[PDB]
Design a protein around this ligand. Structure first.
Ligand SMILES: *P(=O)(O)OC[C@@H](CO)CCn1cnc2c(=O)nc(N)[nH]c21
Ligand SMILES: [Mg+2]
Ligand SMILES: [Mg+2]
Ligand SMILES: [Mg+2]
Ligand SMILES: [Mg+2]
Ligand SMILES: [Zn+2]
Ligand SMILES: [Zn+2]
Lengths: 106, 906, 69, 114
RNA sequence: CCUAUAACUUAAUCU
RNA sequence: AGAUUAAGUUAU
């Protein structure tokens, strides 16, 4: 049960692939993905951001880096369907947190 | 020149253009069904005695109509005119014009408005099919509006599996074939009323349906003429179900524009309709036709009549076939049991032992009521399943079950050990290609949907009767017959007992619960009654190289018990025989592979090796060939069973493993045909089917070759006698069956194991066309097995130093063993490494059971050490080092033990 | 190499199957599809993209904590 | 010994299939027959009060069970409830071409005989 | 839920 | 050397 789960991550960490490591690190910090990552030309991806400091390291503008790929942000809701502009993000309005980002890749 | 062209026009005043130049004849390459004392067979020849003229349209465009002017002699001219004047009033006769023209005054016979190709060209194009050499078939398809000319730009257009639209394209020819049948019956009536005796051949009727050759016709007293139609109908019989020629009989007034006949739902008999169809389309076929095969005289008569029934059962509604049920009262409480069965092949069969009133139920009659699907379907819901095109009887439960297949369990310690030993490098010869593929919940019904490849197939019945005699010779050395219940040997009693018997126990419970007298009473009951049974489909969890799901069929305990008691003596006698053609039961160990190969290379003179593939073999096998295979096995019951007993055993096998009710996910379906994988006789019936298709390919090779260019006079006389025994003679000629069998054993040496085959054949005879090749197998599988066999799945080995390329998925190497050279079987190393890296239980990756598992895999992996490839040889040393590592982490580890498994001393 | 990701796909799909992911047939169908197409992949760049798409099914539900690992 | 258990289990199962059996529309077809003998494939086709339709995609749904009532086997069938592959109750408002990718196909509709 | 047949290996009893 | 039971492996 759990030995299968330990033998997964001991051989996942030996493939040494940046995309697998990028999503396992993001998952470790709580930046998990709600749906399945698509690998087609363009489709939708929903990424949950727990709080601010793990958002600036991924998002700088209209493009965020995920699984060694670039995904352009379309919508940010926060524990509602409370749409939030992209100009909002700064530490200056940090109390202004389970947050969803629904984007599309190139 | 122009004057001759004007004379050909005549009263028609048709605009003609010449296909030849001047007055000389035009040479065409057509297919003729010829029987002389010079030559025989159904081959392609040169027709050199005809001048052809094409008739232009109103806008000066070429149409299908042709004017055929034939010049032979004066005596044939006067004789054909005398026959035509008797036959001119018939509308099935093409209009003839007799004249003389001065080219020196040679006489001419002008036939008016014929098509380009005859019926024999169509029959030969469909019965000798070749991809890239199907120009005649393409021209026929684009001429009669079956498809456009750009249909052949789509690749795999001819393939029945890759492109099922070719069935619709071929069905566009069925109305022309049905019109040719009606015109043949009209021509035979006109020959009988005018007193004319002659043979009807397929090359004398064009694709419009008109008859035009009378050179071999003789006159007799009127009212008593006899037409001979055996070669005609027999060579035409596969086309009747390929083109679906009797489709218009389903409609009202036989009119394709009119709607369908709404038959009665309660109607099941259709005996008089079968007789009306036989009298309408095959009136002058001389052999007696029984619509219900319970009235047949012997097993050859069963084959002959079941062949007409597959054709005539395509007209009738599919709700009439299957079990026939009747309400009976048990202690005054009513049941719904099966008192008969309506077969597509055998007609209506009624049970002989049935009581309307029983006052107590024994274990045996409870068993036949539980096994019967009538009670199960009368209680369940109606089911309309749209995932599959198969017939859906009933849904037994209110849910639909969705069985998935789990992935394999990874064996990490062996993979880490193999990576540490240098395996799985980049660019290496050995890589993992065998895995456990998981399946989603729609896998079970998607595998069941592959019974759409099974089509109703009418056979050439004369050819099939000769082939079943030759096939019978192969099984001659074996002993068979019925046995008692105490002589039955069961290999594994703790296996499934099928449905609905798996709710209460395994097979051991039913073998322990019935006495020997009850088992013998049930076996005697199946000799006078038909017990319909339900077959369970189960997804099978096993390693593979392809992502296709694999289902196994679980047969009921009643069927497999009575079938063991009927067949096991013959099956044990086949399994315990060495040196024969069927090599089921022969081990590859202790020199047995070398003995099998030495036996296959017996007396071939210019030896080459050949193996082939059956695409969708379990699915697409025709019902006539499965019945033929069943009858061959039942030819050992000549002294223990009567003909009624043998018919009822055949009817029980057809109602149990051929067209039974299949329970796939809590719902009942109708199996169209094919072989159940869980019957006792499956591998052996597959062996009979393989030998049958090989003998059919050799017959079609020897009859389609030009008899004038066969250099050996023995082979030419053999081809003449072959045509005589197929089409002219009705009774079995056992001396020619022996002679053709000895010819086959001399020049076509086989090794058969349950649709896997290796043939050592004479190469010079195959290049001359005297024995079969891959092309003949492709043609036979096209017109008979309804599949396309690509030549990439086949192999040919010209150097017999190297063995067969693959047999039972094992390759072959020549190995210095001791003082001599032997043949050793080695498997693909990906399969061996995948068996060690992936297991189906989490209990097979420790130090408990994995030692005896790895020993068995090292036994199967030993002969890779003689391979020239180094990684191939290192597979065995890896398994050996790992058996050591398991042996010290708690005589086999030493390499000598493995060598002893392949040396001839047992 | 390619064999490592072909074995890791097998381990991951058995991990997902232990977490009762076949309770939803829609998710199990594309998990089975991704696993079967990793096991039939020839180029290793094609196998890696599917591995990301399949591992995100595990990183979607909160049933296996990666914090512990 | 164990013969008694399996014979009682066979007898018990075979009897409660008669408590399930319709017994009055069955008699109307079993006695309209020429010899009291009818095919089996028409027994659930004309007598069974419950019908189950397994539908792979949306085109099959609009061609087969569009509306609350539909006609199959020369009868009238009113849908009672629809479930998906995960056996969750689907309403008819959810089965549209817009919401067709969100459903777990196939859908198993259940219709009583009207 | 887990088929049929064939071969082989290992373990344990009786001969 | 033979038979029986249990388990396993391969083939079809
Ligand atoms: P082979 O695998 O190429 O054989 C073809 C085959 C049809 O599936 C028929 C052989 N056959 C019949 N019954 C079988 C069974 O239960 N298991 C296997 N592997 N092969 C069977
Ligand atoms: Mg002729
Ligand atoms: Mg002639
Ligand atoms: Mg096959
Ligand atoms: Mg093979
Ligand atoms: Zn007959
Ligand atoms: Zn017998």
């Amino acid at each position: 049960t759990s030995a299968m789960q330990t033998m997964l991550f001991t051989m996942l960490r030996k493939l040494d692939n940046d995309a697998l490591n990028n999503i396992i690190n993001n998952a470790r910090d709580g930046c998990v993905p709600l749906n399945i990552i698509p690998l087609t030309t363009a489709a939708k991806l929903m990424v949950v951001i727990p709080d601010y400091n793990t958002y600036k390291n991924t998002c700088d503008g209209t493009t965020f880096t995920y699984a060694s790929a670039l995904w352009e942000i379309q919508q940010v809701v926060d524990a509602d369907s409370k749409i939030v502009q992209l100009s909002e993000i700064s530490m200056d309005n940090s109390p202004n947190w389970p947050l969803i980002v629904t984007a599309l890749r190139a | 020149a122009q004057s001759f062209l004007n004379r050909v026009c005549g009263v028609s005043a048709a605009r003609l253009t010449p296909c030849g130049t001047g007055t000389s004849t035009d040479v065409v390459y057509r297919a003729f069904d010829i029987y002389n004392d010079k030559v025989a067979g159904f081959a392609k020849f040169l027709k050199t005695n005809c001048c052809r003229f094409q008739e232009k349209d109103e806008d000066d465009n070429l149409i299908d109509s042709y004017f055929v002017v034939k010049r032979h002699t004066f005596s044939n001219y006067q004789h054909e005119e005398t026959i035509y004047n008797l036959l001119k009033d018939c509308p099935a006769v093409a209009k003839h014009d007799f004249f003389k023209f001065r080219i020196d005054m040679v006489p001419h016979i002008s036939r008016q408005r014929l098509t380009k190709y005859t019926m024999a060209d169509l029959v030969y194009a469909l019965r000798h099919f070749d991809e890239g050499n199907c120009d005649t078939l393409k021209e026929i398809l684009v001429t009669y509006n079956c498809c456009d000319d750009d249909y052949f730009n789509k690749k795999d257009w001819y393939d029945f599996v890759e492109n099922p639209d070719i069935l619709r394209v071929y069905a566009n020819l069925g109305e022309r074939v049905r019109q040719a049948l009606l015109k043949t019956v009209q021509f035979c009536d006109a020959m009988r009323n005018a007193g004319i005796v002659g043979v009807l051949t397929l090359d004398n009727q064009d694709l419009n349906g008109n008859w035009y050759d009378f050179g071999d016709f003789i006159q007799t007293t009127p009212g008593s003429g006899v037409p001979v139609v055996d070669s005609y109908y027999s060579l035409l019989m596969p086309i009747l179900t390929l083109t679906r020629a009797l489709t218009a009989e389903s409609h009202v007034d036989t009119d394709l524009t009119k709607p369908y006949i709404k038959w009665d739902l309660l109607k099941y008999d259709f005996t008089e309709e079968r007789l009306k169809l036989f009298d309408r389309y095959f009136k002058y076929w001389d052999q007696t036709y029984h619509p219900n095969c319970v009235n047949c005289l012997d097993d050859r008569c069963i084959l002959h009549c079941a062949n007409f029934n597959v054709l005539f059962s395509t007209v009738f509604p599919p709700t009439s076939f299957g079990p026939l049920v009747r309400k009976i009262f048990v202690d005054g409480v009513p049941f719904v049991v099966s008192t008969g069965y309506h077969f597509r092949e055998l007609g209506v069969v009624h049970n002989q032992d049935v009581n309307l009133h029983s006052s107590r139920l024994s274990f045996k009659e409870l068993l036949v009521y539980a096994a019967d699907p009538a009670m199960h379907a009368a209680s369940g819901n109606l089911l309309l399943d749209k995932r599959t095109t198969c017939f859906s009887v009933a849904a037994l439960t209110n849910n639909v079950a969705f069985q998935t297949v789990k992935p394999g369990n990874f064996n990490k310690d062996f993979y880490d050990f193999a990576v540490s030993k240098g395996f799985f490098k980049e660019g290496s010869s050995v890589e993992l290609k065998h895995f456990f593929f998981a399946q989603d919940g729609n896998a079970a019904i998607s595998d069941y949907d592959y019974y759409r490849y099974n089509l109703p197939t009418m056979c050439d019945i004369r050819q099939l009767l000769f082939v079943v005699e030759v096939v019978d010779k192969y099984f001659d050395c074996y002993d068979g017959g019925c046995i008692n219940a105490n002589q039955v040997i069961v290999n594994n009693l703790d296996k499934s007992a099928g449905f609905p018997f798996n709710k209460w126990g395994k097979a051991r419970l039913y073998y322990d619960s019935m006495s020997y007298e009850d088992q013998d009473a049930l076996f005697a009951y199946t000799k006078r009654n038909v017990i319909p049974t339900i077959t369970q489909m189960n997804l099978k969890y096993a390693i593979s190289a392809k992502n296709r799901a694999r289902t196994v069929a679980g047969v009921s305990i009643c069927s497999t018990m009575t079938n063991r008691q009927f067949h096991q003596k013959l099956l044990k006698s086949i399994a315990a025989t060495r040196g024969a053609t069927v090599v089921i039961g022969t081990s590859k160990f202790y020199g047995g592979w070398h003995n099998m190969l030495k036996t296959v290379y017996s007396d071939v003179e210019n030896p080459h090796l050949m193996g082939w593939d059956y695409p969708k073999c379990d699915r697409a096998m025709p019902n006539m060939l499965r019945i033929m295979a069943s009858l061959v096995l039942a030819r050992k019951h000549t002294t223990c069973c009567s003909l009624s007993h043998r018919f009822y055993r055949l009817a029980n096998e057809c109602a149990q493993v051929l067209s039974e009710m299949v329970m796939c996910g809590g719902s009942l379906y109708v199996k169209p045909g094919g072989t159940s994988s869980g019957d006792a006789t499956t591998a052996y019936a597959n062996s009979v089917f393989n030998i049958c298709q090989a003998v059919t390919a050799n017959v079609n090779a020897l009859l389609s070759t030009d008899g004038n260019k066969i250099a050996d006079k023995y082979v030419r006389n053999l081809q003449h006698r072959l045509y005589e025994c197929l089409y002219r003679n009705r009774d079995v000629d056992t001396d020619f069956v022996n002679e053709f069998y000895a010819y086959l054993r001399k020049h076509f040496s086989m090794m058969i194991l349950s649709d896997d085959a290796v043939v050592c054949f004479n190469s010079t005879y195959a290049s001359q066309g005297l024995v079969a090749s891959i092309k003949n197998f492709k043609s036979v599988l096209y017109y008979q097995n309804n599949v396309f066999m690509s030549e990439a799945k086949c192999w040919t080995e010209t150097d017999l130093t190297k063995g067969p390329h693959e047999f039972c998925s094992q390759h072959t190497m020549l190995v210095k063993q001791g003082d001599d050279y032997v043949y050793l079987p080695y498997p693909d190393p990906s399969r061996i490494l995948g068996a060690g890296c992936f297991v189906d239980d989490i209990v097979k990756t420790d130090g408990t059971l994995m030692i005896e598992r790895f020993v068995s895999l090292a036994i199967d992996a030993y002969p890779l050490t003689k391979h020239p490839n180094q990684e191939y040889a290192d597979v065995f040393h890896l398994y050996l080092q790992y058996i050591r590592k398991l042996h010290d982490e708690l005589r086999y580890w030493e390499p000598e033990f493995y060598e002893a498994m392949y040396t001839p001393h047992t | 190499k390619m064999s490592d990701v072909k074995c890791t796909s097998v381990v991951l799909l058995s991990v997902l199957q232990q977490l009762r992911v076949e309770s939803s047939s829609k998710l199990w169908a594309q998990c089975v599809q991704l696993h079967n197409d990793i096991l039939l992949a020839k180029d290793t760049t094609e196998a890696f993209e599917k591995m990301v798409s399949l591992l995100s099914v595990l990183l979607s539900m909160q049933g296996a904590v990666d914090i512990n690992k």
